[PDB]
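Deliverable D2.4 — example input (structure tokens):
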């Protein structure tokens, strides 16, 4: 089997991407944030505290003839941005782009933190990291990809995120029309539960490539590119007027600037992020200070190849017995 679904930016900055997902019988369609940095499929629901729902579409398990309470199971998750959610668990039928899993754990939110409430466009998350990170207790549950894998034509999914435009998540096949050149594959460590790999270096604009190992995660659920402070300083030093602002929380730059590109290494191959992809617009409405898309990871503990990096590439998440990542230009 295979699946193919379009993923759409939630706003004009590509702050995140939503993909329609069918849950239950009859189908209830929710727009979920596919997140290769976490491993829980959770949704706003009929059980979510009413004051914490503000425009999201909810899953109502009592209206699904295939929903079953997973007795005793609870979940609770906190993300790197400080947000969180928690609740109970149902199993139900979940389909993505024509690909169907029966008995998928659907984590129903009883509580969500304010950032989720405040984002009316995201109805929940669909985690695509490794199932070892799933938070369900006392019986940990599998991700949608893990449950579908055996049935897929090939044990892979691909992320093809658009810049200010829709893109595609495919399951079970590699669309050879979606990229240019060849796909370069690179090793993955699953020891932290992430799609963790080692970039071979970077370049700023037309500058010379610096060969240096950068361990990080491929995370579709993080907006920006978080890299070591040395790398980020070298980038922003090429932008007149750019500075790190403690009050704003990162590097800002004059909105009148034209940004240089940023290249990262995948083995001997190179992925070029155009400068425009690094512009996240005014820090506040009407400001002439703009927020940078490349930020320091020094306060995280891990480097994160988020959407800013991934949307410059066609990315293969290879879930074979030994997982690997593939990157191609497009």
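Example output (designed residues):
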């Amino acid at each position: 089997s295979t699946g193919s679904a379009t993923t759409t930016p939630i706003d004009s900055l590509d702050d995140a991407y939503i993909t329609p997902v069918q849950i239950g019988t009859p189908a209830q369609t929710l727009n979920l944030d596919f997140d290769t940095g976490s491993s829980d499929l959770w949704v706003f629901s009929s059980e979510t505290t009413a004051s914490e729902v503000d425009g999201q579409t909810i899953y109502t398990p009592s209206k699904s003839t295939t929903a079953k309470l997973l007795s005793g199971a609870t979940w609770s998750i906190s993300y790197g941005d400080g947000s969180s959610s928690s609740g109970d668990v149902y199993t139900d039928t979940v389909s993505v782009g024509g690909l169907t899993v029966t008995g998928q754990a659907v984590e129903s939110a009883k509580k969500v933190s304010s950032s989720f409430t405040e984002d009316s466009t995201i109805d929940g998350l669909l985690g695509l990291a490794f199932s070892t990170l799933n938070t369900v207790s006392p019986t940990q549950q599998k991700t949608f990809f893990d449950n579908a894998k055996a049935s897929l034509d090939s044990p892979v999914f691909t992320a093809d995120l658009g810049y200010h435009a829709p893109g595609t998540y495919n399951f079970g096949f590699i669309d050879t029309t979606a990229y240019t050149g060849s796909i370069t594959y690179t090793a993955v460590s699953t020891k932290q539960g992430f799609w963790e790999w080692t970039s071979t270096g970077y370049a700023v604009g037309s500058g010379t490539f610096k060969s240096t190992s950068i361990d990080g995660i491929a995370d579709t659920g993080t907006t920006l590119l978080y890299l070591p402070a040395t790398v980020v300083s070298a980038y922003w030093a090429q932008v007149s007027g750019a500075k790190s602002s403690s009050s704003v929380g990162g590097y800002v730059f004059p909105c009148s600037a034209t940004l240089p590109s940023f290249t990262f290494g995948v083995g001997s191959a190179r992925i070029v992020i155009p400068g425009d992809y690094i512009d996240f617009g005014p820090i506040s409405t009407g400001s002439s200070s703009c927020f940078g898309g490349i930020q320091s990871s020094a306060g995280i503990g891990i480097n994160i190849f988020g959407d800013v990096a991934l949307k410059a590439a066609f990315v293969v998440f290879n879930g074979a017995t030994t997982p690997t990542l593939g990157f191609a230009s497009k």
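The helical segments are 114-117, 144-148, 229-236, 307-310.
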